Amino acid sequence: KAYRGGHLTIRLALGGCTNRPFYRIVAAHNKCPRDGRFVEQLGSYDPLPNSHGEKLVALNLDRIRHWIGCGAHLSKPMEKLLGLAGFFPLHPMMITNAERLRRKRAREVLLASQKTDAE
Amino acid sequence: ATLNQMHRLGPPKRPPRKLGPTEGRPQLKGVVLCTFTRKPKKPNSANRKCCRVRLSTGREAVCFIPGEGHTLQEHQIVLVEGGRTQDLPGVKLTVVRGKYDCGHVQKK
Amino acid sequence: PMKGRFPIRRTLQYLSQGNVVFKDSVKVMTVNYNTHGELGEGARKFVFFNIPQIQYKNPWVQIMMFKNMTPSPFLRFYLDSGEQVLVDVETKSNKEIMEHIRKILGKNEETLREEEEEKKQLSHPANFGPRKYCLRECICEVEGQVPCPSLVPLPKEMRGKYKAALKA
Amino acid sequence: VRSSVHARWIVGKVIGTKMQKTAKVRVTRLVLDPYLLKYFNKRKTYFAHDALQQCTVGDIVLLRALPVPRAKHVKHELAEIVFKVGKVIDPVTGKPCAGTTYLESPLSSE
Amino acid sequence: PISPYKDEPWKYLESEEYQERYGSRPVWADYRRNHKGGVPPQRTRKTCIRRNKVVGNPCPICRDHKLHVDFRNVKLLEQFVCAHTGIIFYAPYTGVCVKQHKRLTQAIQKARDHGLLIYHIPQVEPRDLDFSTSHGAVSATPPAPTLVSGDPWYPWYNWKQPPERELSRLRRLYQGHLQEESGPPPESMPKMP
RNA sequence: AAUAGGUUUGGUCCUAGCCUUUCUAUUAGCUCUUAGUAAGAUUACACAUGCAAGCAUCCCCGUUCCAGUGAGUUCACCCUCUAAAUC
RNA sequence: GAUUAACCUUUAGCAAUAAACGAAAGUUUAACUAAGCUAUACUAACCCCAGGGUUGGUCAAUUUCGUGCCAGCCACCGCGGUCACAC
Ligand code: FES
Ligand SMILES: [K+]
Ligand SMILES: [K+]
Ligand SMILES: [K+]
Ligand SMILES: [K+]
Ligand SMILES: [K+]
Ligand SMILES: [K+]
Ligand SMILES: [Mg+2]
Ligand SMILES: [Mg+2]
Ligand SMILES: [Mg+2]
Ligand SMILES: [Mg+2]
Ligand SMILES: [Mg+2]
Numbered sequence A: 001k002a003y004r005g006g007h008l009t010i011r012l013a014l015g016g017c018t019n020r021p022f023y024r025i026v027a028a029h030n031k032c033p034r035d036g037r038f039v040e041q042l043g044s045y046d047p048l049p050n051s052h053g054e055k056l057v058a059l060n061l062d063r064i065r066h067w068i069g070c071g072a073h074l075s076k077p078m079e080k081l082l083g084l085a086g087f088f089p090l091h092p093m094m095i096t097n098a099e100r101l102r103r104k105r106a107r108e109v110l111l112a113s114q115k116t117d118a119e
Numbered sequence B: 001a002t003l004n005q006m007h008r009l010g011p012p013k014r015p016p017r018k019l020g021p022t023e024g025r026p027q028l029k030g031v032v033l034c035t036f037t038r039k040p041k042k043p044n045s046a047n048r049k050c051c052r053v054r055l056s057t058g059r060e061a062v063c064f065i066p067g068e069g070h071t072l073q074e075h076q077i078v079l080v081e082g083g084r085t086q087d088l089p090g091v092k093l094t095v096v097r098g099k100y101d102c103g104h105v106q107k108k
Numbered sequence C: 001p002m003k004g005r006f007p008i009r010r011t012l013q014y015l016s017q018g019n020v021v022f023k024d025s026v027k028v029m030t031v032n033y034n035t036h037g038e039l040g041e042g043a044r045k046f047v048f049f050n051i052p053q054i055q056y057k058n059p060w061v062q063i064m065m066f067k068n069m070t071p072s073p074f075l076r077f078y079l080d081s082g083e084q085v086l087v088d089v090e091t092k093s094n095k096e097i098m099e100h101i102r103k104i105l106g107k108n109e110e111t112l113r114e115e116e117e118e119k120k121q122l123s124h125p126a127n128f129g130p131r132k133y134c135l136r137e138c139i140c141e142v143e144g145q146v147p148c149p150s151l152v153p154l155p156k157e158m159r160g161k162y163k164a165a166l167k168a
Numbered sequence D: 001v002r003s004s005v006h007a008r009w010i011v012g013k014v015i016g017t018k019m020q021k022t023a024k025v026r027v028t029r030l031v032l033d034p035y036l037l038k039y040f041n042k043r044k045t046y047f048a049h050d051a052l053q054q055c056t057v058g059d060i061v062l063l064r065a066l067p068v069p070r071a072k073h074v075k076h077e078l079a080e081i082v083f084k085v086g087k088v089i090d091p092v093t094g095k096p097c098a099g100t101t102y103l104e105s106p107l108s109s110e
Numbered sequence E: 001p002i003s004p005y006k007d008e009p010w011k012y013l014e015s016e017e018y019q020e021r022y023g024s025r026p027v028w029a030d031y032r033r034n035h036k037g038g039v040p041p042q043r044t045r046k047t048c049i050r051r052n053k054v055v056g057n058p059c060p061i062c063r064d065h066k067l068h069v070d071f072r073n074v075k076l077l078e079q080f081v082c083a084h085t086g087i088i089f090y091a092p093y094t095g096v097c098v099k100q101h102k103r104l105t106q107a108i109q110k111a112r113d114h115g116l117l118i119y120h121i122p123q124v125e126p127r128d129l130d131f132s133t134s135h136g137a138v139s140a141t142p143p144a145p146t147l148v149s150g151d152p153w154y155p156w157y158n159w160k161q162p163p164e165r166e167l168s169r170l171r172r173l174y175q176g177h178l179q180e181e182s183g184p185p186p187e188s189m190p191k192m193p
Numbered sequence F: 001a002a003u004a005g006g007u008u009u010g011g012u013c014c015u016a017g018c019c020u021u022u023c024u025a026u027u028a029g030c031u032c033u034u035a036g037u038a039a040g041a042u043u044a045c046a047c048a049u050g051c052a053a054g055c056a057u058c059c060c061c062g063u064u065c066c067a068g069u070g071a072g073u074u075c076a077c078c079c080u081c082u083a084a085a086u087c
Numbered sequence G: 001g002a003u004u005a006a007c008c009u010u011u012a013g014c015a016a017u018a019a020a021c022g023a024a025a026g027u028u029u030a031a032c033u034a035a036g037c038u039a040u041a042c043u044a045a046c047c048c049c050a051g052g053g054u055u056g057g058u059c060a061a062u063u064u065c066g067u068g069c070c071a072g073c074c075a076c077c078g079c080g081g082u083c084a085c086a087c
């Protein structure tokens, strides 16, 4: 199904069942359905911690570098996975969301202390 | 046949399966036109209760009414299924007892 | 029983026993043989036993036979470059003919081994998908990972039906 | 060397010469019968450009694909006459033959 | 009923009562399923014990309450394994109900995991062709300069207070739709006391 | 059609059709406790009502996708050439 | 709505993924996600709670009565004419 324009993208295709998500990392045309036809499978991502308390992420780095070199784009969740792996730099919003979380918990710690002080 | 002949004729072709009186459907809806009794072919003897219905497909057919006693009348709705009445020639439909206007057989 | 003499020829096992896989240059293979004569016996058995095996391994190579056109049997190959390779087969047995063409125009065991390996790269063991393409369909099949809810119900805390209930 | 024609080299039998500068060639290939697992001939017709009109009905010819088709059905050209009808030259000895018999003995020219 | 062998089930197969009832044949030797036709259904009944009530033709396991499917009662488990191939018979072979066949399959696998039941263990080849551990993936990587000095990998990972003129420029660009200016974030992640 | 079985005759053998036994799906009758999961108009017949495409300092870009259906039906695959599109 | 033997709620949310747009924080999405309905299926379970169909042979399994070639029955062969394991 030739699309009008478009391009290849490395993104997450959702699998699994209800309440049990599992992602396949695929290179596919951006206009294709999320879970439909793809060009190549480049890895997988299990977001649920396993018995060892680990989130397993498989990355076919050789083929990921190939498809980026062929003009493939990256979805935002995929960019953050590569940042966590050390393959890319940390995404600007992973850094900013971390700072927001620090300011949020710095206010809660301050509110908690003010309440105990009043007590 | 030889290998050359088998190659030339190709694989066998099953005869296109014929559709029965239900036209390949589990059941059909019908409207009762009249009731009557039929005599079975020898060596059986009985007055088997039947009826002529107008099927939802526009075709009219004779249907056997199983069980002891019925209360079907003209202009009533019935559901008909497949299955031939072995000793009634030409009767290939059966009324479903307990559906639409045809109720279940009354106990004893 | 199966019709004809030597019905073993009409089995997939026999047809796959051919060891001649032509190089990409071979495009046509003509076979000239005689129906009678003791010196053309090996060429007749070659047409009878081996041509099916050659065609099976080389489906895109044209093979055409010719009967009693010349005094002696011979094979001729037409290559993509325009070169023609004549092979005189009079007095040779059908096994010697197969070994000859394999040496001059067949792929060696090394070239064939490599091709088989490049095929195995198409079915990566780590990929998940239908059984037709992958070993495993879902990560839930891997021991230690959270199993499928269809077999082991998830804890109430990991279900949206009760996450929204508590939050709402 | 590239060409948009599918059949690059094919051998066939000339079955018609009624078109100008065009020979109608019958090409046969072995096709496996999946059920019987026996090979049968499958024939196809090709029009070949014959500039010199040297083809005779019944001779075996070698066809080469053209870079692009020169007509609706003319995608090949006569590259060589392999076996001239009734005038075969034994490729193994280079002598003329009539069926399975020599017309000139190979011993003539040693 | 209450079986006196529930604690040591392997003793029943060694008693005289067992030898008189079964002899040297398997417990399922004399059982036959009741069904119409010559070809039986491809699944045995789901269970012979339904709400503490036994069916009319209970299977070889359910018809003798002293036979206990336990991973230690290996002599009973061996009767449901092919001695020549090591495969577990499918349920229609012996006639056991689906319930007991699952308990047999689990007990057989548990007995093999504990080494109580002998099964074929093949001889496999090594995973790797070379056993060298010199590659950087399993050895030490020369630490980067930032990692030695204790700096972030990139300088823009840290917060840098922007100049006052650039903040004035943004307060004019978004005048009327501003939030309160945030300062540098905490140096570490706080924690609830 | 299988490890097969029933049925032609006064009887036997051969041939042969039909049917039985197995496994699925839909519908119907009667019946039915819970939990998890998957799947879920007969009709390319007609449709009340609501919603399903926005984004963005204006230009543009998107709404040509996704989602739907199976009416029609060798436009789907390989090779050659070569646009648009991504880098 | 009509029609067919064939019959799911005029729910919620953009939190995840995907898509559109934006330099970006982000915004939108009946895609999707999480719910509702239904023995159509799979898995598991339940102190109390089992039904449906069969019982002449093929083919696992019938006592006593009523009926009397009638009423009725069978997938095939057949059963019922006063001892009917076939209604
Ligand atoms: S198939 Fe893997 S979660 Fe259900
Ligand atoms: K009778
Ligand atoms: K028969
Ligand atoms: K825009
Ligand atoms: K679609
Ligand atoms: K269609
Ligand atoms: K969202
Ligand atoms: Mg009959
Ligand atoms: Mg008789
Ligand atoms: Mg249709
Ligand atoms: Mg271009
Ligand atoms: Mg339905």
Ligand SMILES: [Mg+2]
Binding pocket: none
């Ligand atoms: Mg909404």
Ligand SMILES: [Mg+2]
Binding pocket: none
């Ligand atoms: Mg749902």
Ligand SMILES: [Mg+2]
Binding pocket: G084
């Ligand atoms: Mg009586």
Ligand SMILES: [Mg+2]
Binding pocket: none
């Ligand atoms: Mg009765």
Ligand SMILES: [Zn+2]
Binding pocket: E047, E048, E049, E058, E059, E060, E061, E062, E063, E096, E097, E100
């Ligand atoms: Zn049992």
